[PDB]
Amino acid sequence: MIEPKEIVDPLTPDASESVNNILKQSGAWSGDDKLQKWVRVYLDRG
Amino acid sequence: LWIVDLNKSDLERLGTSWSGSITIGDKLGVSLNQSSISTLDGSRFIAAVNALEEKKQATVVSRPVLLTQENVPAIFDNNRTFYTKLIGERNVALEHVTYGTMIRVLPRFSADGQIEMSLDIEDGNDKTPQSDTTTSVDALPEVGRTLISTIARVPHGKSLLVGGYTRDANTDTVQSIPFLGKLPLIGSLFRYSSKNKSNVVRVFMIEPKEIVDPLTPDASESVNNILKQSGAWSGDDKLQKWVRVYLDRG
Amino acid sequence: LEEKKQATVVSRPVLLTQENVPAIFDNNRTFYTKLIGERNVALEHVTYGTM
Amino acid sequence: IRVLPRFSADGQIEMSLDIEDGNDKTPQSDTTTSVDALPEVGRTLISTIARVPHGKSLLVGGYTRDANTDTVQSIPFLGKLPLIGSLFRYSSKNKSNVVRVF
Amino acid sequence: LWIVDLNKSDLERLGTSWSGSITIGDKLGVSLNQSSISTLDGSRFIAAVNA
């Protein structure tokens, strides 16, 4: 089968809230660590 | 960009399957299910039951980051090899999977503030027939190869999808004996049922952002918080400081 | 011997472009399944390609 | 690493980067701690011009990864009775999470 | 330039997995999990635990 659709809008909600609902529920969240947060924090908000 | 994978599968196997032969007085030989009498004369008929089931679930989320100027190309690619510990040190073996990634882009600015880019991306492992033992494939999940070739524009600081793949599947079979598999009392001792079900999504996202500022705090304070807490700091040594000090402050 | 077999599989790719520009998507996963036995060891596998 | 730098007017530096780092893919270190002794880092390659103000530090590219794995292998009938039903399980979790940035 | 790496992993493995076969009076043979009787007649069923 086939079906296209037109798209003009960004994703709602945002992608940074999608994966942070994945990683805190699949059991792989890695922001608690006080050894690795010193270099992820350069990398999440700019 | 955001790689993301979700895998989920369960499988069950239960039932018997019979074979073998009998004999009567060296005058007649009755065999069940292709058991040749030319290999067996008194070996009576046997059975085989299978019982095993499981539930598998695995996720993997990875992301590359890279910056350019506008109207200039750039390439990023990467491939690590992930090992896992097969059980045994003298009875020795290993198994390993390479995990490759590639991305090249060509961005520009618009008038109203949105970014337009030019994407070829790749991700996956190479097809390797390996990990022969049952949990050896279970240790490291597999993700297939993929390739996009797409220009796509997106408003400032927000996230748009660029392509994906989903898949759902079942399987059902009931293998049995024709006459004796329907009587109510022990008729379900002659079944052989094996369901199977897996369902997998995988999608590539993208989001750019504009950047004008240097990193806050500085990088020399980042690694000096790493090395004094991971336990590898090397400024205490009175034999090696005489040449690192030419090298930290100019 | 007799049996009854039934199987379904439903898959979908998604992708976007602009208008009047080409684009390619292709994919191939390999699906393993657990043959019964760990020391009596064997596997079997099928690649599933899409373009 | 190869580079090609120049000065700007206001004091910032603009450079031209191709960098590489890693080991070559070697199937080796067969014993269990032999891989554990020396860690592995994958190959990487950048091709980027990037400018940065004087004396401060800017990021040029990186890679992170998170993963799980869960499986519960058991016997269908006898794996649910309360008394010794958990003697027929086979559970094996797995979890790794790795960052790396230039 | 500054290379930096952080790696972290943990892994656990626990449980059993069974196999083997029995016999009754040289008249019938019941086997669990692909144990062929064509290699074994009196070798009773075994287990394997990993921890």
Author numbering:
A (entry chain O): 512 to 557
B (entry chain N): 308 to 557
C (entry chain O): 359 to 409
D (entry chain M): 410 to 511
E (entry chain M): 308 to 358
Published text:
The injectisome is a specialized bacterial organelle that utilizes a type III secretion system (T3SS) to translocate effector proteins from the bacterial cytosol directly into a eukaryotic host. The major structural unit of the injectisome is the basal body, composed of three highly oligomerized concentric rings spanning the bacterial inner membrane (IM) (PrgH and PrgK in the Salmonella enterica serovar Typhimurium SPI-1 T3SS)3–6 and outer membrane (OM)7 (InvG, a member of the secretin family of OM pores also found in the type II secretion system, type IV pili system, as well as the phage assembly system). To address this and further elucidate the structural basis for injectisome assembly and function, including that of the central needle component, we have conducted here a cryo-EM analysis of the assembled native needle complex resulting in 3D reconstructions of the IM and OM rings at resolutions permitting atomic model building (3.6 Å and 3.9 Å, respectively) and the 3D reconstruction of an isolated helical needle filament at 3.3 Å resolution.
The density in the core region (InvG176–557) showed defined secondary structure with the majority of side chains clearly visible allowing for unambiguous building and refinement of the structure including significant additionally resolved and structurally changed regions from the previously determined closed form. In the fully open state defined here, the GATE1 hairpin is now unkinked, with the residues at the tip having moved position by a remarkable ~40 Å (measured from the Gly395 Cα). The open position is stabilized by intimate packing against the outer β-barrel of itself and neighboring monomer i + 1 (monomers defined clockwise looking down from the OM), and extending vertically toward the lip region of monomer i + 2 with a dramatic increase in buried surface area between the inner and outer β-barrels (2111 Å2 per monomer compared to 1153 Å2 in the closed state). The inner β-barrel strands 6 and 7 (termed GATE2 here) are straightened around Gly430 and Gly451 compared to the closed form. More significantly, the GATE2 loop (residues Asp433-Gly451) undergoes a 180° rotation, effectively repositioning the regions oriented above the GATE1 hairpin in the closed state against the outer β-barrel in the open state. These changes in GATE1 and GATE2 of the inner β-barrel result in an increase in the secretin pore diameter from ~15 Å in the closed state to a remarkable ~75 Å in the open state.
